[PDB]
Design a binder for this molecule. Structure first.
Ligand SMILES: Nc1ncnc2[nH]cnc12
Ligand SMILES: Nc1ncnc2[nH]cnc12
Ligand SMILES: [Mg+2]
Ligand SMILES: [Mg+2]
Lengths: 181, 181
């Protein structure tokens, strides 16, 4: 009986806050490992995946779940977790979301069933409340106020992203000429 | 005429927020480089300095200013900047502080003279105001809610510090058996 975390996102590009959130939530709960799960869709997914793999490269605790990139199309989270739980029927999944996202959990397709499928884990964040419907358990993570949009904006404006983004990922962005449009 | 940033702290231990604050403040202002300036004083300074040098190792933009470790004793910031400006009379110093510290600027010894010596740079932070006496100019930095005390507490409790602290610094802490008391 495995316990596995999932951190979803576009990861466009992956950055330090993704790594801290995944490692801290998983390690604090004592999960076996945490997967960063890129969503489908504008740069090609191969790039997002290469950067993701570079970012988690040296750390067996963090891995990449690619099922959403392969299946494409609709991708409601319920459908994804339904495939993952059928593939891994003895795995307890811990679906990690930022405290800010916990509010929109009603907008989630078949959130009813989804909460019976997986364990939602909220990341306590300043400003947003620790209250919600649905069974969410919470974990404390140092606030890291970085977002992929912020990074892309900094790249577009020609500002530094060092330490906000892993060195191997910065090198890839520059080698492939990403985000400078 | 050089423009040089200074980021003071105990750095006990150095961590990701120190590196982001220093790099972002310096790069956003277009400074020539930024020095992390460890204060005097309980682990020996050699350790704090070794970790600092490991942390900035691969980045010519960030350096370590050791004058406070060498002079010891009182160490009012005014005295330190007085020595540094006499040593480097054509350098304009930019003294970087967190937005939270800008409030206590009156508690600073000879803050009057100190503001004529250097340029204070405040780091805009959530919660704390962008108002103050004294001539402070401000720079935006992604909020990174890490502190040396937090890290030490995590080490003492046996929690993960990966990504919160550079890999070379984690290795040193573990190699020297620091902070696990
Ligand atoms: N929801 C998200 N997906 C991918 N990257 C992010 N960075 C910040 N938020 C993100
Ligand atoms: N004032 C400070 N000095 C050294 N390390 C810190 N980490 C957070 N705040 C610090
Ligand atoms: Mg299984
Ligand atoms: Mg000079």
């Amino acid at each position: 009986k495995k316990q596995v975390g999932i951190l979803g996102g576009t990861f466009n590009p992956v950055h330090l806050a993704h790594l801290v959130m995944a490692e801290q939530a998983g390690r604090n709960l004592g999960l076996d490992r945490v997967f960063l799960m890129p969503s489908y869709q504008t740069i090609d997914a191969k790039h997002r995946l290469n950067m993701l793999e570079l970012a988690v490269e040296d750390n067996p605790f963090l891995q990449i779940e690619t099922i959403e990139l392969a299946r494409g199309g609709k991708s409601y989270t319920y459908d994804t977790m339904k495939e993952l739980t059928q593939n891994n029927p003895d795995t307890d999944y811990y679906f990690i979301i930022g405290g800010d996202m916990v509010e929109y959990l009603p907008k989630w397709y078949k959130i009813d069933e989804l909460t019976s499928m997986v364990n939602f884990v909220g990341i306590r964040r300043p400003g947003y409340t620790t209250d919600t419907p649905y069974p969410v358990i919470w974990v404390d993570v140092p606030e890291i106020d970085i977002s992929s949009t912020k990074i892309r904006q900094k790249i577009k404006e020609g500002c530094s992203i060092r330490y906000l983004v892993p060195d191997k990922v910065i090198d890839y962005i520059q080698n492939e000429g990403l985000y400078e449009y």
